[PDB]
Short mmCIF file of C-alpha atoms and ligand atoms in Angstrom, two decimals:
data_model
loop_
_atom_site.label_atom_id
_atom_site.label_comp_id
_atom_site.label_asym_id
_atom_site.label_seq_id
_atom_site.Cartn_x
_atom_site.Cartn_y
_atom_site.Cartn_z
CA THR A 2 -5.26 -264.26 81.20
CA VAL A 3 -3.52 -260.90 80.74
CA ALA A 4 0.18 -261.15 81.58
CA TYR A 5 2.33 -258.02 81.77
CA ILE A 6 5.96 -258.53 80.72
CA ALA A 7 8.79 -256.05 81.25
CA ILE A 8 11.40 -255.97 78.49
CA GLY A 9 14.82 -254.40 78.95
CA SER A 10 17.97 -254.35 76.86
CA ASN A 11 21.27 -252.66 77.68
CA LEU A 12 22.94 -253.31 74.34
CA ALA A 13 24.62 -250.18 72.99
CA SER A 14 22.16 -250.17 70.05
CA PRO A 15 19.21 -252.21 71.35
CA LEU A 16 16.34 -251.56 68.90
CA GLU A 17 16.88 -254.67 66.80
CA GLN A 18 17.28 -256.93 69.85
CA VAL A 19 14.14 -255.52 71.45
CA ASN A 20 12.12 -256.00 68.25
CA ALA A 21 13.40 -259.56 67.87
CA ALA A 22 12.26 -260.23 71.44
CA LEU A 23 8.83 -258.64 70.88
CA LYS A 24 8.36 -260.70 67.73
CA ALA A 25 9.34 -263.78 69.74
CA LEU A 26 6.82 -262.93 72.48
CA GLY A 27 4.03 -262.62 69.95
CA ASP A 28 4.91 -266.06 68.58
CA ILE A 29 4.60 -267.87 71.93
CA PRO A 30 1.89 -270.58 71.60
CA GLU A 31 -1.65 -269.91 72.83
CA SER A 32 -0.74 -266.23 73.32
CA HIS A 33 -0.69 -262.91 71.51
CA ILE A 34 0.34 -259.33 72.17
CA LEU A 35 -2.44 -256.92 73.11
CA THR A 36 -0.37 -253.75 73.55
CA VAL A 37 3.25 -252.62 73.77
CA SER A 38 4.35 -249.55 75.69
CA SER A 39 6.57 -246.90 74.19
CA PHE A 40 10.30 -247.54 74.40
CA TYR A 41 11.95 -245.65 77.26
CA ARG A 42 15.57 -244.81 78.03
CA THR A 43 16.96 -245.34 81.53
CA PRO A 44 20.50 -244.05 82.15
CA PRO A 45 22.64 -245.96 84.65
CA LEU A 46 22.80 -244.41 88.10
CA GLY A 47 26.26 -245.47 89.32
CA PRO A 48 29.10 -246.08 86.86
CA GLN A 49 28.44 -244.03 83.73
CA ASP A 50 30.29 -246.44 81.42
CA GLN A 51 27.42 -248.94 81.31
CA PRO A 52 25.06 -248.21 78.40
CA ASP A 53 21.57 -246.89 78.87
CA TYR A 54 18.78 -249.43 79.15
CA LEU A 55 15.86 -249.52 76.76
CA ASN A 56 12.78 -250.47 78.77
CA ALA A 57 9.22 -251.27 77.76
CA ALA A 58 6.14 -253.14 78.95
CA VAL A 59 4.04 -255.64 76.99
CA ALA A 60 0.49 -256.84 77.59
CA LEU A 61 0.28 -260.48 76.49
CA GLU A 62 -3.00 -262.38 76.44
CA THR A 63 -2.26 -266.04 77.15
CA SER A 64 -3.93 -269.30 78.15
CA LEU A 65 -0.61 -270.79 79.26
CA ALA A 66 0.09 -271.54 82.89
CA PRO A 67 2.43 -269.03 84.58
CA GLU A 68 5.42 -271.36 84.77
CA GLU A 69 4.83 -272.29 81.11
CA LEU A 70 5.02 -268.60 80.18
CA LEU A 71 8.26 -268.30 82.19
CA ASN A 72 9.70 -271.25 80.22
CA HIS A 73 9.09 -269.34 76.98
CA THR A 74 10.52 -266.03 78.21
CA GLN A 75 13.65 -267.87 79.35
CA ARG A 76 13.87 -269.67 76.00
CA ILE A 77 13.68 -266.29 74.24
CA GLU A 78 16.44 -264.94 76.50
CA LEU A 79 18.64 -267.92 75.56
CA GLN A 80 17.88 -267.62 71.84
CA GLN A 81 17.85 -263.83 71.33
CA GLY A 82 19.51 -262.38 74.43
CA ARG A 83 23.16 -262.47 73.29
CA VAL A 84 24.58 -260.53 70.34
CA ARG A 85 27.70 -261.32 68.34
CA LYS A 86 29.64 -258.36 66.95
CA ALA A 87 33.14 -259.68 66.09
CA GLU A 88 34.75 -262.94 67.20
CA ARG A 89 32.53 -263.74 70.21
CA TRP A 90 28.98 -263.66 71.51
CA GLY A 91 28.64 -260.92 74.11
CA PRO A 92 26.94 -261.42 77.47
CA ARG A 93 23.17 -261.59 77.76
CA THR A 94 21.74 -258.10 77.28
CA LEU A 95 18.00 -258.88 77.15
CA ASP A 96 15.83 -259.23 80.25
CA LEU A 97 12.23 -260.46 80.17
CA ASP A 98 10.39 -260.17 83.49
CA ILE A 99 6.86 -261.24 84.32
CA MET A 100 5.45 -258.37 86.32
CA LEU A 101 1.84 -259.50 86.69
CA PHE A 102 -0.14 -262.54 85.59
CA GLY A 103 -3.83 -261.81 85.71
CA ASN A 104 -4.57 -261.19 89.37
CA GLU A 105 -2.68 -264.30 90.45
CA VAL A 106 -0.22 -264.40 93.35
CA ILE A 107 2.68 -266.79 92.70
CA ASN A 108 5.49 -267.67 95.12
CA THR A 109 7.38 -270.74 93.89
CA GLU A 110 11.08 -271.49 93.64
CA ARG A 111 11.11 -270.16 90.06
CA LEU A 112 8.44 -267.44 89.94
CA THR A 113 7.43 -264.52 92.19
CA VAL A 114 4.38 -262.60 90.93
CA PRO A 115 3.82 -259.68 91.35
CA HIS A 116 7.51 -259.17 90.51
CA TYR A 117 9.43 -258.86 93.77
CA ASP A 118 10.97 -255.43 93.11
CA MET A 119 8.75 -253.73 90.53
CA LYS A 120 7.42 -251.27 93.13
CA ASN A 121 10.95 -249.79 93.41
CA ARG A 122 11.62 -249.57 89.64
CA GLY A 123 10.32 -246.58 87.72
CA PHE A 124 11.62 -248.29 84.56
CA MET A 125 8.99 -250.97 85.18
CA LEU A 126 6.16 -248.89 86.62
CA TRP A 127 6.13 -246.03 84.08
CA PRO A 128 5.85 -248.19 80.93
CA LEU A 129 3.20 -250.27 82.67
CA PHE A 130 1.27 -247.14 83.66
CA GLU A 131 1.28 -246.06 80.01
CA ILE A 132 -0.55 -249.21 78.91
CA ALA A 133 -2.63 -249.96 82.01
CA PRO A 134 -3.23 -246.82 84.10
CA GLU A 135 -6.17 -248.33 86.04
CA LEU A 136 -4.20 -251.46 86.96
CA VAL A 137 -4.93 -253.02 90.37
CA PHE A 138 -2.63 -255.55 91.98
CA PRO A 139 -3.90 -258.84 93.46
CA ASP A 140 -3.64 -257.47 97.02
CA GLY A 141 -5.60 -254.31 96.18
CA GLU A 142 -2.72 -251.86 95.74
CA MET A 143 -3.16 -249.62 92.69
CA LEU A 144 -0.42 -248.85 90.16
CA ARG A 145 -1.41 -245.19 90.17
CA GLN A 146 -1.20 -245.23 93.98
CA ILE A 147 2.36 -246.62 93.89
CA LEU A 148 3.51 -243.92 91.45
CA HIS A 149 1.71 -241.21 93.45
CA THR A 150 3.44 -242.30 96.67
CA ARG A 151 7.03 -242.44 95.36
CA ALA A 152 7.00 -239.63 92.76
CA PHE A 153 9.54 -241.47 90.61
CA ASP A 154 11.39 -239.45 87.99
CA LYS A 155 9.80 -239.79 84.56
CA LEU A 156 11.80 -241.54 81.86
CA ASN A 157 12.49 -240.12 78.41
CA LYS A 158 11.28 -241.92 75.31
CA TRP A 159 14.05 -243.74 73.45
N1 ZX4 B 1 17.19 -249.76 83.58
C1 ZX4 B 1 17.12 -251.14 83.96
N2 ZX4 B 1 16.19 -251.97 83.33
C2 ZX4 B 1 16.23 -253.25 83.78
N3 ZX4 B 1 15.45 -254.30 83.39
C3 ZX4 B 1 15.63 -255.49 83.94
C4 ZX4 B 1 16.64 -255.26 84.84
C5 ZX4 B 1 17.23 -256.34 85.77
C6 ZX4 B 1 16.85 -257.73 85.21
C7 ZX4 B 1 17.00 -258.77 86.35
N4 ZX4 B 1 15.87 -259.65 86.40
C8 ZX4 B 1 15.96 -260.57 85.17
C9 ZX4 B 1 14.90 -261.75 85.23
C10 ZX4 B 1 14.93 -262.47 86.57
S1 ZX4 B 1 16.53 -263.44 86.62
C11 ZX4 B 1 16.72 -264.42 88.16
C12 ZX4 B 1 15.65 -265.46 88.44
O1 ZX4 B 1 14.43 -264.73 88.83
C13 ZX4 B 1 13.34 -265.74 88.74
N5 ZX4 B 1 12.10 -265.00 88.73
C14 ZX4 B 1 11.38 -264.88 89.85
N6 ZX4 B 1 10.25 -264.15 89.64
C15 ZX4 B 1 10.35 -263.84 88.21
C16 ZX4 B 1 9.54 -263.13 87.36
N7 ZX4 B 1 8.34 -262.58 87.93
N8 ZX4 B 1 9.87 -262.99 86.07
C17 ZX4 B 1 11.03 -263.56 85.65
N9 ZX4 B 1 11.91 -264.28 86.40
C18 ZX4 B 1 11.53 -264.38 87.66
C19 ZX4 B 1 13.73 -266.62 87.59
O2 ZX4 B 1 13.45 -268.00 87.96
C20 ZX4 B 1 15.19 -266.40 87.35
O3 ZX4 B 1 15.91 -267.65 87.49
C21 ZX4 B 1 14.85 -261.48 87.66
C22 ZX4 B 1 15.90 -260.39 87.64
C23 ZX4 B 1 15.54 -259.40 88.78
O4 ZX4 B 1 14.79 -258.40 88.54
O5 ZX4 B 1 15.98 -259.58 89.94
C24 ZX4 B 1 17.10 -253.82 84.81
C25 ZX4 B 1 18.02 -252.93 85.42
O6 ZX4 B 1 18.78 -253.29 86.28
N10 ZX4 B 1 18.05 -251.60 85.01
#
């Protein structure tokens, strides 16, 4: 099954954290990366003191069940998501979100697929459109149609 995973990091210098997470995704059992979007920069919209986010999308081929894939993404967040710089580990700065999982619809306590808010997030839709422009959602909405309707601002490459 082709799962599409959004990866974001708001560390001040996030390239090494993002690469550690991508390496970790490729090492998930019974799975392997098919394609990775470019890295994109998303400035914060409200308070300008928060760092920019680095955002990307990953196509992962996997035979795992959806909740099993979520277990691994959450393990990676626990293992790689915090960075130490001086005397303490900072807060979690890495987010891994399952956007789509084949054409399955999931609505459990733990997992909502398609991701509940991806249709409002250019930082999710634009990297996904780069790697899967013909993507169709389980209910028949088209990724191109969503971007056409909202005319989201394009994001700069990192
Ligand atoms: N520029 C920019 N880039 C950005 N990147 C990412 C963000 C916000 C990340 C916030 N995001 C982090 C992961 C989860 S954490 C909560 C619970 O959600 C459950 N869950 C349900 N369905 C899920 C699914 N499909 N995948 C993964 N978890 C899923 C899970 O059980 C967990 O316990 C959702 C949360 C959110 O999006 O609400 C952001 C930004 O703000 N700005």
